[PDB]
Amino acid sequence: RKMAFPSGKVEGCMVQVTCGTTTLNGLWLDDVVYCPRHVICTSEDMLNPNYEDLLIRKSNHNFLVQAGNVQLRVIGHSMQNCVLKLKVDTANPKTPKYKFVRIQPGQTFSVLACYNGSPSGVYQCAMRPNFTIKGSFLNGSCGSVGFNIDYDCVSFCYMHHMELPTGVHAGTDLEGNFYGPFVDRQTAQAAGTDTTITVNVLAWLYAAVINGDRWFLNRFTTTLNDFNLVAMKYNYEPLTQDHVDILGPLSAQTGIAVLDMCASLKELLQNGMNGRTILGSALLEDEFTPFDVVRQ
Amino acid sequence: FRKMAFPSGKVEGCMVQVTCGTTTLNGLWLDDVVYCPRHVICTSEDMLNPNYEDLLIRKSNHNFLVQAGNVQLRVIGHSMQNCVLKLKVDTANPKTPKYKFVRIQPGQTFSVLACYNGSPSGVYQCAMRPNFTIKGSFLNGSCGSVGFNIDYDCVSFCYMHHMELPTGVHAGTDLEGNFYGPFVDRQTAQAAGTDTTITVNVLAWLYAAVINGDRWFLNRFTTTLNDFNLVAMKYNYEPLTQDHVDILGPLSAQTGIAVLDMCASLKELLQNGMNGRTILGSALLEDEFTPFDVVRQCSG
Ligand SMILES: CC(C)(C)[C@H](NC(=O)C(F)(F)F)C(=O)N1C[C@H]2[C@@H]([C@H]1C(=O)N[C@H](C=N)C[C@@H]1CCNC1=O)C2(C)C
């Protein structure tokens, strides 16, 4: 299964941030609360916000930060790209070992969706090639974060900011830089055409072989360029030599050369599943990374 | 629309490691009791045809090693309830949540916190299948992992993991040690029965599709429970009951599609398939969202 990481280490960091009439989630790590800067916007500000001007007018006491039933005293504030950093009185005693990481398209992570500072649910997802997330976010969900956990260290990679017209989601890393060409402004924008994460589909096919299914293999191989010429006709991402190298261990462990697995994928695209499933799915799964495969 | 699990933090603080001889699995630590599958008291060879009464008599407190992180918990008593072992320990879990033990029905969903060596590994959302199995993801050492729901700070534990059947699906007990399904904790040939699709959940998921603006499958027709159930039996779908209809009532009122109107859509989808089209991006009809699940996610 696509699994999320256990969310407890992040649940202990979620807080509520309110400025005027607008309330969203904040991330409380040590003595800083991170949250999307449009918390300082009213409704008349969303179309063309001047964030420098909106922020200079705020005092510390304009920011109401609540961690459960406890109010946290804001003692300083600062804007870093599209994220606000609220310095508070108190270091979060539940701060886990953590770091901030900016991820690349195709990378997976877990999302803890929150409202009013309290967690609602957790799910796994991927950063799409068009720098969006196929998330599940409602009003008040901004400031929810995405993360991985490695040896009890939480790497925060995503903070939620907005929803695009096709229902997909856009946000920033924890230094406030958007993924993709989006802005925290309620102006017309749209995700680029989204493609399938080819390297993840192939890793998942290798996972199927490791799991003992081989029905989709064939006797063909392919050059890299012929594979990409075919796959791009199905809106699959081009497979780079770096992707080929990445799959090397899985290729060695199964004895199926990467370009031979590429030939199998070409045939699967041409034929479909003919009523079969692969690892319990009737679709070609692309939100499972080569790293994820080895780690499960 | 995402398959979302509950936040797992309240449960993570209850997972411990239980070892009896060579056999190690996970245990659930609530106040001063650790709950785990009773087959922990088995050697590999015992598991082929165990006599649990006798194997438990021969054991003492000193046969059990319980580890909560870096800390050993001393076992001061032991007993069995059905297929669950209960280890009384010298220290009450200071992270014990408000909780209840509940037994769920086929078609109900829950989150699983997958654990190995007492350490939580991942969380995912599951349904109790009509054939009482669960389509989980469980490896060696996963026994004792639990499934749960949360309602307002109270964790309702409903599943504890015991075994994997030859089709790769899974069987376990409630926290009182009562099996779900006709399975026994013995390493002997057993198999999942033929499964069916959870009709009330497919309907809930069609309401979620409508809520999300996916409306092409709606049609002008209505049907009856009797007529729908005749086509349901044909396609290996759980018969739809009057309880299912009232349970769907709120979704029916939020969307303006009467429940019997939606059943006609599902009927049509079941016979003619899809014209290649998708619903919520899905090629198949999804049945692991309950009506409550759809309301929670669509309302936050
Ligand atoms: C969807 C809406 C048309 C309203 C708008 N979108 C676009 O303007 C775009 F289309 F350009 F993206 C949009 O998301 N916002 C408008 C305003 C913030 C953001 C916003 O309300 N964020 C919410 C945080 N709590 C999460 C949203 C709520 C609905 N579902 C979500 O995930 C900012 C971009 C500054």
Ligand SMILES: CC(C)(C)[C@H](NC(=O)C(F)(F)F)C(=O)N1C[C@H]2[C@@H]([C@H]1C(=O)N[C@H](C=N)C[C@@H]1CCNC1=O)C2(C)C
């Ligand atoms: C799969 C195996 C053929 C080994 C066997 N299955 C059947 O005997 C069945 F077919 F009858 F079910 C089986 O699961 N067990 C045999 C033995 C316990 C159980 C068991 O090892 N449980 C594991 C607990 N850590 C979790 C398993 C590990 C693999 N994936 C899992 O989920 C008991 C039934 C007493």
